[PDB]
Every structure is written in C-alpha cells, then in structure tokens.
Amino acid sequence: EFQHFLRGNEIVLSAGSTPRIQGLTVEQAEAVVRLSCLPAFKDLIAKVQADEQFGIWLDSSSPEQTVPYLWSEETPATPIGQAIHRLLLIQAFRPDRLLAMAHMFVSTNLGESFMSIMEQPLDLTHIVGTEVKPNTPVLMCSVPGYDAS
Amino acid sequence: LKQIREVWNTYELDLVNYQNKCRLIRGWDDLFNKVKEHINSVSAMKLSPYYKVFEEDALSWEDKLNRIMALFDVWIDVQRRWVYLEGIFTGSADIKHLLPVETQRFQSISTEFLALMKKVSKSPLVMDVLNIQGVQRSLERLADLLGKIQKALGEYLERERSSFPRFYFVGDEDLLEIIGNSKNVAKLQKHFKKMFAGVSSIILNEDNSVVLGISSREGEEVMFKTPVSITEHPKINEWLTLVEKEMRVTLAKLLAESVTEVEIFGKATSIDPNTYITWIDKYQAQLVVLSA
Amino acid sequence: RRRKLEHLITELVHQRDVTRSLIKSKIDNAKSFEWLSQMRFYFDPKQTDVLQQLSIQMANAKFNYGFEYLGVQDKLVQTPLTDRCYLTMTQALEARLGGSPFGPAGTGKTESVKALGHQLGRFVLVFNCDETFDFQAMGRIFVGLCQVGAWGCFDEFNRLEERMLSAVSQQVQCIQEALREHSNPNYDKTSAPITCELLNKQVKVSPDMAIFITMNLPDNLKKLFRSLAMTKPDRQLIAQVMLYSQGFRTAEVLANKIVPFFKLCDEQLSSQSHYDFGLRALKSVLVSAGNVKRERIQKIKREIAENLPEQEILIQSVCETMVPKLVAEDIPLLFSLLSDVFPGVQYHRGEMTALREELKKVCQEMYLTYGDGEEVGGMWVEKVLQLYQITQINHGLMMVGPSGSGKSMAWRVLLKALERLEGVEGVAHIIDPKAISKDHLYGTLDPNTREWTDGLFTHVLRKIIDSVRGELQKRQWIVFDGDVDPEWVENLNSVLDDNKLLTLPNGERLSLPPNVRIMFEVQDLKYATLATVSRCGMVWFSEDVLSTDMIFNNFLARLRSIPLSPMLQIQRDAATIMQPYFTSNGLVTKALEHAFQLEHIMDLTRLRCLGSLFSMLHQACRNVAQYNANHPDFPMQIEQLERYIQRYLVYAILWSLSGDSRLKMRAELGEYIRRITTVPLPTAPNIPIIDYEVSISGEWSPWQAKVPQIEVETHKVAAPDVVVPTLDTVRHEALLYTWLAEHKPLVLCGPPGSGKTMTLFSALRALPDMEVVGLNFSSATTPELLLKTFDHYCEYRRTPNGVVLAPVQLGKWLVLFCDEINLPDMDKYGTQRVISFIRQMVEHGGFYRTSDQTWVKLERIQFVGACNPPTDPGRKPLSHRFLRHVPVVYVDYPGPASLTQI
Amino acid sequence: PGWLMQLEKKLHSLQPHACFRLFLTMEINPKVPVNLLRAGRIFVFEPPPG
Amino acid sequence: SKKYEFGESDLRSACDTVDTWLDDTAKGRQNISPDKIPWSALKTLMAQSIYGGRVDNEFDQRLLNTFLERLFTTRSFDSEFKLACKVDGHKDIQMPDGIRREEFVQWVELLPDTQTPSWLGLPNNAERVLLTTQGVDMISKMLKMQAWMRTLHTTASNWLHLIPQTLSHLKRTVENIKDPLFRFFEREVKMGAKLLQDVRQDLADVVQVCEGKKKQTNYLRTLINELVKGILPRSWSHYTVPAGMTVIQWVSDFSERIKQLQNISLAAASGGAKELKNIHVCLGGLFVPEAYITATRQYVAQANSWSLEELCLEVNVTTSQGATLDACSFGVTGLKLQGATCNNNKLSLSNAISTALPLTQLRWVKQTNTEKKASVVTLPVYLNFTRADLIFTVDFEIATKEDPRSFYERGVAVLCT
Amino acid sequence: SRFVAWMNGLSVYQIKVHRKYTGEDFDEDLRTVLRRSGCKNEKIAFIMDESNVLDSGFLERMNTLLANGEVPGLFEGDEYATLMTQCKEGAQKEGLMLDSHEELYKWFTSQVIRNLHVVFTMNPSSEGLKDRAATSPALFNRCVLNWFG
C-alpha cells in the first residue's frame, strides 16, 4: 500500500481509460486503472458503476470525512488499514483533499492531539528557560519580509 | 656535515649590472631555499644525541646561517624599495623641487647604499658580506629610512590628490608623471581622458603658458572666455581647478547665448535653413541639443 | 555637423511624438501629470552660480545641470522603455537611492544609464566588471566619485567574483548608507558635511553623486536599490528614428521590414559563435546603409535626385556586412529570408575590375586558379574580394575556415595584388602563438632589475613604429597563424578596438600606425571571448570554397614548371599522360569521394591524401628520370612511359587513399578501382592490387618477387638484427623511401609492437646520408625539448642572409624520430604546443628565436613520428592543420603467414 | 558568514554562566554556515497568511 | 507568473510617494477634494517605478495596471464602492466608510475569518490546484526520504521498449527547399533523430552495465547517478522542459514527440510539399514551437507576393475536426484554455480549469492596419503548465456579458501542454 | 625484490619521499643513482612504490630513463662538468681512453644500461593503471609486467 502510495501510482500503461461516469473525468479514470493493479481493491470500475451516490461524493466540499467502501476485501476492522485504504482512495479521487486526508491518517495513528501544538502559537518562556543550554545559541530564522525580534 | 663546508666556500652573490652603473643581487632562491635547508639539516644533526663526531661543529655554523638569514631578508627588501624609489626619483626632473628634503634624504641613502654595493662587488662572497662591521645595523637603518621616505611620498600623493579630487581616477605612476613632468605640457594630455568626460586635450598657448580652451577627442573645441594662465598659477592642481571652473562658466555662458538665439527659431512660423545651419555650426553639440 | 544634425533629429522626433501624442489628448493644465511626467528644463539666466541656472525635472525631482563638457556623445532614441527607465531612475535618485536595471544583455541598460547621466550633465564612469576589473582601483575611484560629484556605474555586476563582489558590495553599501542621510527631515540643512568610511578615513560625500548596478543582488543592497526590468528594447522605433535621421524616406516601412529580418537571422540560420544580430549590429547596418545611400546620391549627382530605391540600398548594406560571416550553407537561407521580407529586390554587387585584373595576373604567376563568376575559383575570388573590403574597414580582421580551405593563399595573393596595384610594398610577419610562451610574446620585467625585455609581438611592433627603414612606405601585416584562446588575446584587446594602442607592464604606450593589420588565421573560433570576436570583423572560409578541381589544376601547373631542362621535360610528358585523370571525373576524384566512407584512423582530410598522391607522383617522375639517366643510349621511351605512369597512378592512389586503414579497406578500395578504372590491371584470381608494384618498363610485378628468404647468423637473433624480409616490410620499405626522398614529414600509426620504429630504421639504412635523433614524446612535453635537441645537434646559427639552423655534420639530414607524437598532453584550450611548433616549422620552414627575436630557417631537418590508434586510451587526435602535411601509415600486426615467415 | 563561523567556533569554549542565552535573528538563506545551524537550537517564524 | 518579491521596501516607497504627492497637491491642511487627488500620478508611479519595476512580462504589467486602475480611482471616495466585486457571486466586500484610521483598523479586525482566492480576483478553484500541488510535493518529499543493478535494469529495459525505434531521418529534396515548412520540419527531424540516437545509445549502455558486462566510465557513472535519484539527466535536455520533471514524465513526453516526428516524416515521404500543410501538428511536441509559427508565416507570405510583416494572426477554434484547412489556415491541436471556455469563437469565464481546444486553426490574414474593437482580449500562449516562456499571443472575442479586465485579473491563458 | 637483489649482488636504492618533495629533489636523487650506476660500475636496483609517486614529473623522468637509457636535460652545465669528471675517473679506472665528451657520455649511457634495474611496486589494477599507462607508456613496453597476486 505504501509502495503504491509513493511511486506505484506513477506507473505507465497502454489503455483502459474509457470514461464511465460523466462526473468521473479521464485523469481520474486513468488513476483508477493504476489503482486497480493493487490486489487490495482487485476491482474499481465495477464498484463505481453502481452506487451513483459516489458521484455526489465526487463533488463534496470536504470529501474525506466520509468515504464509501470501494475496496471489497477482508474487513479492515483495525482503524489503520481503513485509514490507509481511504488515503489511497483519496489520492485516486480529488488529490487536492489529500493533505487534509493526510492529517486524518496521522490523527487516527497518533491521536487527535499530535499536531495541535503547532496550531497554537509558541511561548519560548519555557523552551529557553530549561530546554536550552546556556552554551546553545537560539537561532530565530525569519521568512524574508518578516521580523521575529 | 662536511659537504656544507665545501659548498659554502663557493657561492658568490650572483651580481648583475644596472642601468645607472651599479650592481644588484638576483639570486634569491639559491640564497634562501638552500640556506633554510642547510639550517634545518644542521639543527636535525646537532639535536641528535649522537654528536661524537661533530661535538662542536654545528653550533659554529647555525649562528652563521641565522646571520645570513637576518641579513638577507632585509637586504632583499632594501634592494626592492631602493630600486623602486630610484625609479620614482629619477623620472620627471621636478621631484628635486617638490619635497626637496626627501630628495636630499634619498640622495644620502643612495650614496650609502652605493658605497655598500661597491664594497660587496669588490669582494663578492657569501662570507665576505659578514666581515663588514656594522653591516646589519646599517642595513636596518637604510630600511627604516627608505620606509619613512616612501611613507612621506605616499602622504604627499594623498595630500595632492585631496586637492582637485579628479586625480583619484588616475593611477600612481600617472599621478607622479602629472605632478612632476609639469614644466612642459606634452605628456599630461594622455591622462585627460580619464580625469574628464571627453576632454582629451587642452588648447595651450604658443609658448604653452596660457590655457585658452578645451578640445575633444574627435576635434570639437570650446574656447574659454577668460583664459587660464599657468605663468601666474603654478602648482598644477590649482590651475587644473581653474580650468574646470572656467569650463563650467564658459559652458553656462555659451548655453545662455545659444538659448537666447534659439528663442527666435522657437516662435517663428517660417525658418531660414542657412541661419539654422550657421547656428548649428556655431555652438557645441550638447549646448545645441540643450538649447532645443 | 552631421552628428549634430543626427542628435537634433533624434531629439526633435521624440519632441514631436510627445507633443502630438501625450499633450494633445485633451490636456490644458500645466500641473497635470501627463505633462509633469516628461523631462522638463527651466533656464534662469539671472542666477549668479553656474550650478544654479539650468534646473531639470522629471516627475518631481529637481537636478542642477552639472556643466560638464561631454563633447559629442551619441544620443539614444527615446523609446517608451527608455522613458520609464528615466522616470524610475530619477525617482530612485530623489529618494536618495540607486538605480539597478536588470535583464538580458543587449537591451541597453548601461547605455540608458549613461545617457541619463549625460542628459543631466554628469561625468559618468562605467566599470565593465567581468575579467578586466581593477579591484585595487576601487578604493580611490569611489573616493573620486564621492568628492568630484561624478555619476559612476556598473556593468554585469553578477559577473564579478564572489570575494570581490562582497568587498565592492560592502563599499557601495557604506557609500549608499551615507548618501541616505541627505534626506533626513531632522537633518534637512547640512550643517556638518556627510562623511563615509572608505579607506579608514572620513570622506565627504557630495549629494550629486550616484551608484548604478546593472545586472543580468546581494542582501546588503536589497533595501537600497530600486530595481527595474529592461528585458526588450523597442527595436522598431530605434530603427525608424535612425533611418529617419539618415535622410531615408519611408523609414517606418524600412524599419518594419528590417527588425523582423534580424529577428529571423538568429532563428532560421544555424547558430554560430561569431553570429551577432543584436541591436548594435542593427545600428551598424543602418549607418552603413546611410553612408551607401549618400554615396549613391553623390555618384548620381556627378553626371536633389531623391528617388533612389531605398530597399535595394538597405539589402546591399545588410549583405555587405553579413555575407562574409556566413558558413557558405546559410547563404541560400539568408537570400530566402531577404526575398521573404523584401518582396522583389535583388542584391547588386560591385566589381572592382582593376583588382580583378591584379588578382588574375598574380594567380597566373603563382600557379593558382582564378574565376570571375560561377566557374572554378569564383567563390575563392569572392572571398578574397571580401577580405579586401574588410581590410579597408577594420584593422583586426580574422579569417576563419576549416583546414584545407584557401585562406592563407587568399591573403598572400591579396597582398601581392595590392602591392602591384597600389605600388606600395607588402610585408607579412607570420607570428605563431601557442608555440612561444606568452611571457616571450609580449615581454617581461625582472623584479630585481626593473629591466624591460620586449617579447616577439612587442619587438616587431616597435620595429614597425620606429622608421628605421620604413613605417608608412610598406604595409605591415601581422598574421597570427594559430588557434586563439583568451590567455594572450586579452592583452591584444586594446589594439583591436578603436584605441589602437598597446599598453605595457613597464608603463609604456605603443600606437600602431594606420598601415598595420592584426590578422588571425584560425579554424575553430570556439575558444575566444566575445570581446575579441566583436572588436573586429571577419570573413569565413569554407571547405567547398576551394574545390578539388583547383587543387588538381595547381598540382599540374606546378608540375609543368618548377624542376624537381630534361627533368622538367619528363615532368611535362608525364603531366600530359596524367591530365585525363584530373578532369573532375573519371578515376582520381571518384576514388577520392569513395574513400571518404571507409574506416580510417586519424580521420581523413582532402588535402592530406591529395598531398600524398602529389608527392608520390613527383617520386615517380624523378624515378623515371633516374632510369633515363641510368641508360645513356636508348633513352626512356614515351610509349613505355605512358603505360608506366598509367599504372603508377593507380599504385599511388591505392597507397595514398587507403594507406591508413586495415587490409579490408585496402581490398575494398582495390575492388572499387577494379570496377571503375580503365588502365590495365594485374590478372589475379583474388590477390589484391596492394600486393603489386609498378616496376620500370611498366609491369605489375608482384611484391613477392622481392622477398629474399634468407637465413640469419646464429649469434644474432635479437632486435638490433636487421629485419627478416616479408611482404609488409619490403612494401613499407619502398613506401617510406618514396616519402623520405622528398624530405616530407611522416607519421606511422599502429598498435604497439607492430614494428613502426623497426621499419623506419631499416628504411633509414637504405639512405646513406640520414642521421637519426630519437626523441621520446610523452605527457607534459613542450617545444623546449625540440629546442634542446637543436642546441645539441644543430650548433650552426650562421647568418649569410638570415639565421639558418643546420646540423653539425656536413651534408647530412637529421630525422627527429618523435615516438608517440600524439601523446603530448592537450591543454584546456584544445591544442598541443609541440604539435603547433612542429607544424609551423614544417609549413613555414622555420621559427622564431625567443632570445634575439629573429626568423631562423631550417636547413637539413626532417620529421618522422610514431603513434598508436587514436582510440587507444591516453591518446588524443592530432590537429587537422598539422595532419594536412603528414601522410600517415597504418602498420598492423603481421599476419600468421608473416609471423611464420619471420 | 565568516564572522558567524568565528562566533560559532568561539562558542565551543564553555561559558560557565547558566542564565546567559544568545539569541541570533536569522535569515533563511543557504549562505549561513551549517556548523552554527547544527550547533544551536533552531526556530522558524513565518508571516501568517490571509 | 513569476514568484516576485514585493517586500516592505515597495510599501515604504509607495507611502513616501503618496505623502509627497498628496502634500504637493493639498497645500490646504484640511479636506482637499474627492477629485483633486493626483490619482494619475499615483497610478503611474506604482505601475512603472516602484511596483512595476520588478515585472518582466507584459501580462503581469497588464494585471498590475488593472488592479491599480480599479482601486485607485476617485470612486473609492464614494460611500458605496466594491473592493471585491464578487466573492461567492452574490457576496460583495464594501468599502468601509470613515475619515480616520481607527475605523479602517476596526473594519480590518472585523473581516470575516473565511478567506477564498475569490477575494484576490482569482477563480474560486485556485485553492484546489494549490492543494494538489502541495500534496504532490509532500509525496515527493516522502519518496526522497525513503544490489540496485537489478532494480535499474528492468526499468531501463522498459524505457528502451517504450521509446520508439530510430526515426527516418531521410527528409531530403531538391525543389522543396523554397518551402519554409519543409526546412523547419527537416531541421526538427534532424534534431530529434540526433537526440534519439544519443538517448538510445546511453540507455543501451546503462542496460548493459546494469547487467555487469562493461566497466562504467565517468559520464556513464554520473548518468546512472542521475537515473537512480529519479532526476532528469542534464545531457539529455536539449529543448525547453518544465522546471522539475521526473525521468518517467520526460521519457513519455519524448516518446510522444518521436511518434509525432515519425508521423511527420512519413507524411513528408508520402508527399513533400503539399502534405506538410495538411498535417495536424501539436505545438507541445516540438522542440521550437515558435519556429513553427514563423515557418507558417513564411509559407503564407511565400504563397502570395505579400511581405512577411504585412500578415496578422487570426484564431478559429473549430468544433471537433471540420478539416476545412483553407489556403492560409493551419491546424494545431493540444491547446488548452485555462479558466475559460469557447463556444464557437467567443470566450466565457468558467469555474472548471483546463478546457481543451480541439483543432485550433491559425490563419495569416493580410492585415488592414486598423484598430480592433474594444471587445477582444489578448491571451498568452505559454509552453508549460509553469507559465515561464511565451510562444505568442492570440486575439479572442468575448461574450458581451463579461469585461476584459475580469479576464486579465482572473488569469486565463492558453497552454500547449 | 630486496632479497633477490641482495642475492644477485645489487645495491638496493630507495626514495624516502615526504609531502615536501618536488621535481628538483627527484632530479637530484636520479643524479645520485645515475652517478652510482654509471660511475664506479655499481649495479643498482632502484625500487620505488606508487606511494613514492606524487607528481607527473616523476613518471616523465621514468619514461625518459627506462627507454634509451640516459635522461636528457637532467644535468646542468656545472652538473655536466662534474659528471664528466666522475665518468672520466671511472673510465680510467676501467682502462678506456679519454677522447672527447661524446664518447665519455656514450660510455656512461652504456654503463647505465648495463648496470641499472628499475622496479615499480603498484596496487591492483584500477583507473590508476590506465592513467599511469597514459602518462608514461614505457612501463608497458620497457618494463615487464609481472602480476603478483
């Protein structure tokens, strides 16, 4: 699954990119053809032929909170398998939401508090008081056009 | 350790003739690399505990090699600075009148250095430069005197450059030629192209004592309304400042006259081609375009 | 007055455009920004101060016109890009900032900055940066800028080395930071002058100065410089204004037709290093067209008649500048583009019939071929005329072309013809760089003496300048017959350009008189800074300019004359027989064309095989004359001579064209000759013609008849023992005898251990008056080795009529057997010093002494070398300019039969 | 960058005081020596979007 | 189009300019006028000196001029003024009334926390493509944070098979040199054949060295190092390429270009002077696309007696493949409109990106030297999805509903790939 | 090599090279070995390693020496006079007559040919072997290559 996630979706093929659903475009169809080679699905065209609600899911504003079970394999009762399958599916359809879905795959793998610290602005009064040795200089890099002094 | 003894009795100073009937030392690689190799070798030999065959044979020569180094590292510097200062002081025949105290100081230094040169050339040998009593101390004295006179020359050059700052654009030898070779004006004109923009010459008088105007590289000329007089303004930088000031004022007056003439063309329904051509031929190009 | 009129036209066109376009758009208020945005001048003739009379305003910034005398500087066409550049630069200046235009090179950033500085009357200095930058001078030049009140500038600041870039950036940051303080609201009045730290001192900064940095910038200056994008100038408007200033009517149409034309010549034509289609070239073309139009007007008026075809003048000016630079295959492309943009106008050309007659008379006595139109030699004569045209324009023309093209003979014939016509003597000094160290080319100062010892170039230039014999009665032509690279050409820059002066490290200036041309005879042009190739025009020679038919005609003409009386008679009787084979068809040229598709080591050149063929034909002529001298009664009969020469020609063509390939290619060429020839051939089932010799009386005697099976003495079975005869040995014996009789250089290329050295030495036993000097070439080998060899074996330096180098022994010829002649290391400029040295002293028959700067001539020296196949590791290919003279021999490993016999 | 290298190589000398901290305002560019970057703690400040 | 730098220095310069010009015009210390403000001075100075200084291409200057003209008019002093014409179509952003900085600051602090690219005038779906690019970049980083003879050999053989064999570099003639299209296509085919031969030889050497049959040289060593890292070799890029491209994408694009050149060579062999015009070439598969435009112009000028510079381009987006192909019409395919759609020949703003244009027809009409109506727009034709190289500019009519400034500030363009 | 050289009656010579060796030091060592070989009729086994190689000048001198005996340009004028003195002393030691400079030089070259053997020791084959062959082919022609596995 990870191998397909990183580079396995960048393979090349001959044909099979026929459009089936008017809402499903040619690039999405060709991504489906790539994803079909993974035995974790073993069929994707048949699944999208039925369940016309999928088309509506293809136009949702946040189509990663809810995702239909297009994979038709043994039940991924463990949340990690469901999350990774859904992440691969999100890479297939609507890659823009991928990052958001990425967060979910982190959260369900590390709790819904892992990246919440970065969202809150930092307070150095604790970092420099204890975590910084007096011999270690604290560098404060700033993006050009901004000052952190 | 013997080979050192046989070889050190064979080096001369490898002298060359000079333009002003002198002698100079050119061999420095053989008189530095070989000597430092020898001193390293004798140090390695003597610091070795087995000196039963040279119990007192290396301390007798390590001091000699140290004296060779101490004399020659200053001798080379003295030679280079003296030849450079001789080239400076025997160029334009006016530095004898500009800073005469430096001229006489360098005369005395050159006299002493030529006495030393004759002394070494009479008996050329790498040991016959050690028997001269006070050769070392006189050498540092000559080095200090040459350094002081070179520093004084640099300070004088900076002082001259501070007035009429256009001298900052020219080099050092060019500036020396400018300040020195000033009695006659036939070599200053090759540096005017780097002190001004387009001023490639100066219109001298018949006896090159009064500056009447400026000439361009192609041949355009502007004639000063009040000529600059060198016969009444010596000290070249001063009359150069006068020339540039007269250039500014003459350009201003010519521009005023030209624009006054052009005001006729500006408000004329017709125009005579001959009059326009005469006006074009009268004034300079930049003045003409500015008038338009 | 012409330049003044041009400046007035350039200014008034912009004035009219501004007045009618940007002022007539319903504008009536003098304070409107549509008027306040232009460059306004206000003159007050009552202000006493000189620097307070003329006030120049751009948008809201007031500048006092510094009354610097700029002379006559060329103005710039005020394009809208130039207008916005002026506005941005003045806005930066008013905010006490610096202007930093950027963009691709060639859009006129430096020129725009300089023009703006001149418009306000400010002495501006441009620093080229790049390589000629003077890092030492900046310390005082910046102080001069600060105190004098000058303008200053920079050119391609990013092209500066990082450490000098950082130092200059710090200095300019300090200067600009000090300049920023003049606009302080609290410090509006300057009670204390602003001071800056440049040379560890307080330097007063005049408010009127500036700094401009034109790039193609460091973080220090990012908050101090107003950037500006100048990516493309308005070429159409510039061309239209320049053509209008030249008097051309319908100038807009001509500009609209010519700007796209130059936008095509860099897209359709094959890219070349010397191809320049920038705005500078366009301006040069326009001024040349104006001069041509005025010349036409003067010629017509000498029988205001302003009805000339201006498109014809424009295309003539374009052609007269672009045709010589073409590569002889883009000429149809150039004319197709011209017919595309100019629909129905043809390029007419001058004739110069007097020069045509002079060239014909000179070529008739030099055994060359002359042609006026499409006949043989027409292109070569056209190239010579183009060279003459470039001679009168520039002084640093550099003829370029692949080896074998007739460029050396071109300028030799031109010099002779000009001497005959103009009546002034012609002298040419063929100086060859990269064979002499650059230190001994320009000269050197010994630091312990300050003595100036001039090098070869400085010596000959000083001899020209000093009127010892003649400085203006002759025409000195310093020709640099050798490939170029930016190591010595950098010192020649100040001579090629308009300065026409050479500076010396000892502080001396040498101005060459207006009768000296600095010509280059190169073949690659691939290692040269654009500054060198841009400071001087050039004419491009090509391989097809010199056809093979002219080579054959020259060979036959030099055979019917120049005795190798009875010798010349036998040469003529043989030339008559060989004439039907040099008819641009038939035998020789068909085989020459067919031999260019065969696998040849040391890739073939048309002038190498032909030279070998001519040498061996000369050997045949002297052989048949030797036979005639052998029998006093019954001299050599013409009938037998015919059939002797007819077969010796085939023997020579086989051993010259296929003399550097394996037996397969030799057999293939033999079969091709069998298929195309008409002369009698040996009657053998499968034995190749390579295994036969054209014996005297005209028979194909098999080489096997000269293989004496001998038994060597028992005690000597070693290498010093003479060779045991075999086919290859006894064949290479005759071949090397043929090539050594005429004192021709030789190269034996073959795998190691094949027997090249042994075969050469065995051949050298037959010759009884040839001494051998064996040199072992290797990496890091330089022409000094040959100099030491000459000092060891050629002590004579007598001067009867010039320095002549001769061997110590009388009546003997030395052969310098340079083993592994292609082994010497090739430097990073694609050349070998020793190869160029041994090429100059073979082609020109001498060289230059580095000590006394004199032309020493060879007397009895000859060159033979050994090699390995160039594909062998550690071996590098030889230059074509050197390979052209040396015929190479491929000595392969002896076959099983040869090994058994040996 | 050279003076920054000098500072970082000086910092290897022990500074006995415990309350002494050295804050270095920094620009995100590769010209900074890697030695200081590895030696000291790093913080990155960005302008919030919108 | 470029990642410019619009740091604080430009804002300081703009503030200084505003201060200077407002003080110069408004000598009166109190309210001066809604109309006497030197709007033209401010607009020109921002557009040409301080903000437009860093702008290289013409279209970014056009966008900056559009923004400055929309924002810096006297209408901004009116009580009602839309800073953003349409956020969600019906949602507008009103100009906050006030004469002192406190109310403006209060307005800024009371801005809704929701923010969409429509506030910037961009299409509302720009966030989508931005997020897609960010996700692809994240995948690339993770891949970069993740013997090999066997791994490289299989993919090298796959690339060798995928790339077509050597093309027929045989376009030779004697009476078709006068045809500019033949010249351009001949040089294109020659360059393609040379590059294909070099790539094929290098790939075969890589295949054989991955099998351990020959000792790698320095050039082969660095080529293999480039290949294993997934970075396109430097020695292969002889034509314009998007900045950053994996070797797989480059290999596929090169295979497509070689296929197109093979078809062109076959058509030339069939004809030679009459079929080169009738061919339907895609501008993305050519090493020098603008050279094709120049050659087409040359051929059109050669057919008649007109000069090359008297012709103007005209674009017809013919539906499907009409195959009209007039004497001056030329067929180019693969062009994609960005953020706009064309019905017959008129543009219309769209919320869906990358609309495909089938069989664009380029005609060279002898221009009448007249000013076109103020109802057309000039669209750039870039080469890559990264708009960093201009080929030419088309002139397209628009539906009467929209205005050209919306097209300018929305960022519509034509892409060849 | 040392064992067989001693057992053959050959004085082993070696170069103790440090990082401060230059071309001139190697020229002096070659002058010493040639004086020991030509003059005094002493056979020498000049053995050196690839580690005893630092500059291409070493291999250039080896190329000039291994082939055709004498090294051209190795001796300057003073060195020429000195070598002539030692070689004439050796010639009168053997008994040959003193006629001219040339025949003393040729006797010296013949003695060097007969009484000198150069041994190189190198690490197994790499691109270094190709480079060494390129800079000097003598060690592939004059020197017999004996692999020592």
Ligand SMILES: Nc1ncnc2c1ncn2[C@@H]1O[C@H](COP(=O)(O)OP(=O)(O)OP(=O)(O)O)[C@@H](O)[C@H]1O
């Ligand atoms: N009409 C002709 N004009 C010029 N050369 C001719 C003509 N006919 C025959 N030749 C021969 O062509 C050759 C011209 O060689 P040239 O010296 O001009 O070439 P180059 O390119 O300057 O030389 P190199 O290859 O050594 O650099 C000569 O061998 C000359 O005899």
Ligand SMILES: Nc1ncnc2c1ncn2[C@@H]1O[C@H](COP(=O)(O)OP(=O)(O)O)[C@@H](O)[C@H]1O
């Ligand atoms: N506005 C203009 N008017 C006239 N000539 C121009 C103009 N702009 C550029 N040029 C010409 O372009 C040539 C090259 O400009 P150059 O100084 O090399 O610019 P850069 O140094 O930025 O490449 C100059 O010789 C100049 O004559």
Ligand SMILES: Nc1ncnc2c1ncn2[C@@H]1O[C@H](COP(=O)(O)OP(=O)(O)O)[C@@H](O)[C@H]1O
């Ligand atoms: N009669 C002969 N014919 C051909 N080859 C021979 C003959 N006699 C000896 N040889 C071989 O030719 C070789 C020539 O050696 P050498 O001249 O050093 O080779 P090269 O100069 O070709 O590199 C000898 O090693 C010897 O084995």
